[PDB]
Curated annotation (Swiss-Prot):
Start and end residues, zinc fingers (PHD-type): 4-54
Portion of the full sequence shown: 306 to 360 of 1544
Effect on the protein of changing residue 5 to A: Slightly decreases interaction with histone H3
Name the record gives this protein: Lysine-specific demethylase 5B
UniProt comment concerning the protein's domains: Both the JmjC domain and the JmjN domain are required for enzymatic activity. However ARID and PHD-type 1 domain are not required for activity per se but contributed to recognition of the H3(1-21)K4me2 substrate peptide. The 2 first PHD-type zinc finger domains are required for transcription repression activity.
Length: 55
C-alpha cells in the first residue's frame, strides 16, 4: 500500500485520486465503487450508512 489511503472495496491505489474518506467512521471507498456519484466527487463528506445511524 504505497499510497497513504487505499480503497478497502478495491485498494487499487490509482483510484486514490477519487478515493473518498469517511469522516463519520474510518472507511475509504471510490466515488464510483460504492456511492452513486462517479468521476465527480460529491460535495460534503460522504459517510457510509452505518455512520449515519450513529447520528
Ligand atoms: Zn473502490
Ligand atoms: Zn463511514
Amino acid at each position: 500500500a504505497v499510497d497513504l489511503y487505499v480503497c478497502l472495496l478495491c485498494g487499487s491505489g490509482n483510484d486514490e485520486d477519487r478515493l473518498l474518506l469517511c469522516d463519520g467512521c474510518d472507511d475509504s471507498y471510490h466515488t464510483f465503487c460504492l456511492i452513486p456519484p462517479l468521476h465527480d466527487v460529491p460535495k460534503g463528506d460522504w459517510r457510509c450508512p452505518k455512520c449515519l445511524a450513529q447520528e
